[PDB]
Design a protein around this motif. Structure first.
Motif, mmCIF file in Angstrom:
data_model
loop_
_atom_site.group_PDB
_atom_site.id
_atom_site.type_symbol
_atom_site.label_atom_id
_atom_site.label_comp_id
_atom_site.label_asym_id
_atom_site.label_seq_id
_atom_site.Cartn_x
_atom_site.Cartn_y
_atom_site.Cartn_z
ATOM 1 N N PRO A 13 36.832 30.668 36.140
ATOM 2 C CA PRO A 13 36.581 32.113 35.622
ATOM 3 C C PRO A 13 37.753 32.900 36.173
ATOM 4 N N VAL A 14 37.843 34.232 35.419
ATOM 5 C CA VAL A 14 38.902 35.178 35.535
ATOM 6 C C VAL A 14 38.646 35.889 37.062
ATOM 7 N N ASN A 15 39.638 36.433 37.753
ATOM 8 C CA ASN A 15 39.250 36.918 39.082
ATOM 9 C C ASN A 15 40.276 38.260 39.307
ATOM 10 N N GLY A 16 41.083 38.349 38.187
ATOM 11 C CA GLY A 16 42.199 39.455 38.277
ATOM 12 C C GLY A 16 43.302 39.224 39.389
ATOM 13 N N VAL A 17 43.336 38.065 39.938
ATOM 14 C CA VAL A 17 44.462 37.993 40.992
ATOM 15 C C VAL A 17 45.349 36.879 40.367
ATOM 16 N N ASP A 18 44.913 35.657 40.761
ATOM 17 C CA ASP A 18 45.761 34.536 40.005
ATOM 18 C C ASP A 18 45.180 33.798 38.907
ATOM 19 N N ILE A 19 44.041 34.035 38.157
ATOM 20 C CA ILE A 19 43.627 33.839 37.219
ATOM 21 C C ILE A 19 43.107 35.106 36.416
ATOM 22 N N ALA A 20 43.637 35.364 35.488
ATOM 23 C CA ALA A 20 43.656 36.937 34.735
ATOM 24 C C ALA A 20 44.034 36.938 33.198
ATOM 25 N N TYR A 21 43.325 37.595 32.668
ATOM 26 C CA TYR A 21 44.242 38.256 31.203
ATOM 27 C C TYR A 21 45.358 39.071 31.408
ATOM 28 N N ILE A 22 46.347 38.764 30.744
ATOM 29 C CA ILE A 22 47.474 39.556 30.920
ATOM 30 C C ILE A 22 48.254 40.087 29.724
ATOM 31 N N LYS A 23 48.933 41.207 29.614
ATOM 32 C CA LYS A 23 50.003 41.389 28.563
ATOM 33 C C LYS A 23 51.295 41.445 28.965
ATOM 34 N N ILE A 24 52.000 41.293 27.922
ATOM 35 C CA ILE A 24 53.584 41.241 27.991
ATOM 36 C C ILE A 24 54.081 42.795 27.742
ATOM 37 N N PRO A 25 54.651 43.646 28.502
ATOM 38 C CA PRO A 25 55.014 44.820 28.355
ATOM 39 C C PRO A 25 56.224 44.933 27.273
ATOM 40 N N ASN A 26 55.917 46.076 26.424
ATOM 41 C CA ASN A 26 57.110 46.364 25.486
ATOM 42 C C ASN A 26 57.523 45.112 24.734
ATOM 43 N N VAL A 27 56.729 44.716 23.754
ATOM 44 C CA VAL A 27 56.798 43.450 22.820
ATOM 45 C C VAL A 27 56.243 43.953 21.606
ATOM 46 N N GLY A 28 55.338 44.701 21.517
ATOM 47 C CA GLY A 28 54.496 44.927 20.081
ATOM 48 C C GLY A 28 53.197 44.807 20.557
ATOM 49 N N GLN A 29 52.083 45.041 19.678
ATOM 50 C CA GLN A 29 50.658 44.931 20.122
ATOM 51 C C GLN A 29 50.278 43.842 20.244
#
Ligand SMILES: *SCCCCCCC(=O)NO
Ligand SMILES: [Zn+2]
Length: 423
Positions: A13-29
């Motif tokens: 399960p995700v926890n927002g610390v070391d297991i999380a959904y992330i986004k790459i900045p300034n890539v495109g949507q």
């Protein structure tokens, strides 16, 4: 001790610390992807890289116009949850195999300390981070928070076997060549490996050999990490600087040129093809770039953000670049300490040196010809271990690199494509 202290499962399960959904900045949507922090400043994304380059947002083969003979395509690889689970355990196993050696512990230490420089400010007196050196982590309340990082291990793009470093650039600074450094995205897969020939005359001939021996993927990953170390310290050589091969008749018959960055990364005999006068030109250049980093840290009395002090931020860069602190409090570049760190990143961290530590069979030079590519599965301990790789001790695969012998240990390798003769 262990480099990755948690045996992650992809379905954890995700926890927002070391297991999380992330986004790459300034890539495109993009849609947030599930990522795993296996170590401080190092993340792993078990997905095919369709982000870092807006151009390659398609896993299917392109129209064979810029296509390479040494290529392999499979749009379905790394698409199921079981594949991403084994990818995560495979990358984890290779990091521990690298960390189980003194050379790998030194390289991984330098990578963690290689924080990209905080030179994003247009005002000389203020220190500011560069935005493209972080990722956006979704916290357990749906909000995003930015977190700096040095390394990201991600799956390959359309061409599965093209393991390439990718980092976001700047229209004002060459972050990988001005000493600053940048966050490095490494396309890599532990589920494939290449075959090479055990005799130098056959391995460097484009018409002979089927790939009897398989390359240890720990060597392949370390090779990419050596590139990342150069780029994280901003001392990578411009890929335009090349050595037009005069040592191989088949290379010059086609006019094949190899960058100095690749010759330096392999080490051994290949490194001396870079002539001594140009190497001195490179060292002086990066020595000057280190002093401007010392100069901009001297002309800095402010800081942007509330996540760190200026004294801490001035300190971590003193530890990274090994600057000298005088009594007045301003930093300088000791030539003996710069040559010490520069030689460690360029001459000590080499593919040839990692071969000596791993006790494996490997290609003798970067100036060879690829033979084949195999499908492997290094996660089961009956196939591949931390301390032995394929050459498992106390079995018939222990001696003579029998574990890497794809004819003796055939059940561990499935040949997918031959490259010999297609040059
Ligand atoms: S991050 C490495 C930059 C150059 C990519 C070439 C791929 C390679 O390393 N082949 O050995
Ligand atoms: Zn390389």
């Amino acid at each position: 001790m262990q480099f990755v202290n948690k045996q992650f499962n992809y379905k954890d399960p995700v926890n927002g610390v070391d297991i999380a959904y992330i986004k790459i900045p300034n890539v495109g949507q993009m849609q947030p992807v599930k990522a795993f922090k296996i170590h401080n400043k190092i993340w792993v994304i078990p997905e095919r890289d369709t982000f870092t380059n807006p151009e390659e947002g398609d896993l299917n083969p392109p129209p064979e116009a810029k296509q390479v003979p040494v290529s392999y395509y499979d749009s379905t690889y790394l698409s199921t949850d079981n594949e991403k689970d084994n990818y995560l355990k495979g990358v984890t196993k290779l990091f521990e195999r690298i960390y189980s050696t003194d050379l790998g512990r030194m390289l991984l230490t330098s990578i963690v300390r290689g924080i990209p420089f905080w030179g994003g400010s247009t005002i000389d007196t203020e220190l500011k981070v560069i935005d493209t050196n972080c990722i956006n982590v979704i916290q357990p309340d749906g909000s995003y928070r930015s977190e700096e990082l040095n390394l990201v291990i991600i799956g390959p793009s359309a061409d599965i076997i093209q393991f390439e470093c990718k980092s976001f650039g700047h229209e004002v600074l060459n972050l990988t060549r001005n000493g600053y450094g940048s966050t490095q995205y490494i396309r890599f897969s532990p589920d494939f490996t290449f075959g090479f020939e055990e005799s130098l005359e056959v391995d460097t001939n484009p018409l002979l050999g089927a790939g009897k021996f398989a390359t240890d993927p720990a060597v392949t990953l370390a090779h990419e990490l050596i590139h990342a170390g150069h780029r994280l310290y901003g001392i990578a050589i411009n890929p335009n600087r090349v050595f037009k091969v005069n040592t191989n008749a088949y290379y010059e018959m086609s006019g094949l040129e190899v960058s100095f960055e690749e010759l330096r990364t392999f080490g051994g005999h290949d490194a001396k093809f870079i002539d001594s006068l140009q190497e001195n030109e490179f060292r002086l250049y990066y020595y000057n770039k280190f002093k401007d980093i010392a100069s901009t840290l001297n002309k800095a009395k402010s800081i942007v953000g509330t996540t760190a002090s200026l004294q801490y931020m001035k300190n971590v860069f003193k530890e990274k670049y090994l600057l000298s602190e005088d009594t007045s409090g301003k930093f300088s570049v000791d030539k003996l300490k710069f040559d010490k760190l520069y030689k460690m990143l360029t001459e000590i961290y080499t593919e040839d040196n990692f071969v000596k530590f791993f006790k494996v069979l490997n290609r003798k030079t970067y100036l060879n010809f690829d033979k084949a590519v195999f499908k492997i599965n290094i996660v089961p301990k009956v196939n591949y271990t931390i301390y032995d790789g394929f050459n498992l001790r106390n079995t018939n695969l222990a001696a003579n690199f029998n574990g890497q012998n794809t004819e003796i240990n055939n059940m561990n390798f499935t040949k997918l494509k031959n490259f010999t003769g297609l040059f």
